[PDB]
């Protein structure tokens, strides 16, 4: 049971996504890829916006690029 | 003498920059604006240009906008 109760518990977790993936059948490229997409997007938006926002927005766009680091790290 | 000393050098400096302005009469925008343009491009470049060293090119591009930063405050 100790794996079995952990089984369904974590198994029920995909269901949430899956249930909502039933509702929205849609995808986003993982492995920090959508990060790097949203990175440049805000990374240029940093240079596209710029100001006290791009002060923050670059720092933002780094955490975007910080996600691909972790899994690779 | 010291003012006459620093006056000679800036004169000694200008004529050299003027003698090269005889040669290259391009006058490139100073006051950090050059830094910016280079910082923007090289950043745009580091985005695409390497697969790794985008570290240093933007870091380079960062050092560009530095000299601007210290004097605006």
Keyword list:
2 chains, mainly alpha, part of a larger assembly, 81% helix, 73 residues, 0% strand, T-complex protein 1 subunit beta (chains A, B)
Description:
Chains A, B: This is T-complex protein 1 subunit beta. Chains A, B: It comes from Homo sapiens. This is part of a larger assembly, with 2 copies of chain A (73 residues). Chain A is an all-alpha fold and 73 residues long. Chain A contains 3 helices and no strands. The radius of gyration of chain A is 18 Å and the shape is elongated. The two termini of chain A are 34 Å apart.
Tally the beta strands of chain A.
Answer: 0
What would the principal axes of the Cα set say about the shape of chain A?
A: elongated
- Using only CA atoms, what is the Rg of chain A? 18 Å
Q: What is the CA–CA distance across the termini of chain A?
A: 34 Å
Helix content of chain A: over 70%
Chain oligomer state: part of a larger assembly
State the largest interface.
Answer: A-B, 3 and 3 residues
Secondary-structure element pattern of chain A, one letter each: HHH
| Number of DSSP helical runs of chain A | 3
The main β sheet of chain A shows up as: none
Pairing-aware structural class of the strands and helices of chain A?
Answer: mainly alpha
Strand content of chain A: under 5%
PDB class: chaperone
Keywords: TRiC/CCT, PFD, CryoEM, Molecular Chaperone, Protein folding, chaperone
Entry title: hTRiC-hPFD Class5
Chains A, B: T-complex protein 1 subunit beta
């Amino acid at each position: 049971q100790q794996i079995l109760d952990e089984a369904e518990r974590s198994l029920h977790d995909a269901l949430c996504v899956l249930a909502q993936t039933v509702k929205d059948s849609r995808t986003v490229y993982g492995g920090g890829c959508s990060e790097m997409l949203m990175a440049h997007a805000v990374t240029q938006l940093a240079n596209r916006t710029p100001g006290k926002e791009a002060v923050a927005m670059e720092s933002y766009a780094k955490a975007l690029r910080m996600l691909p680091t972790i899994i690779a790290d």
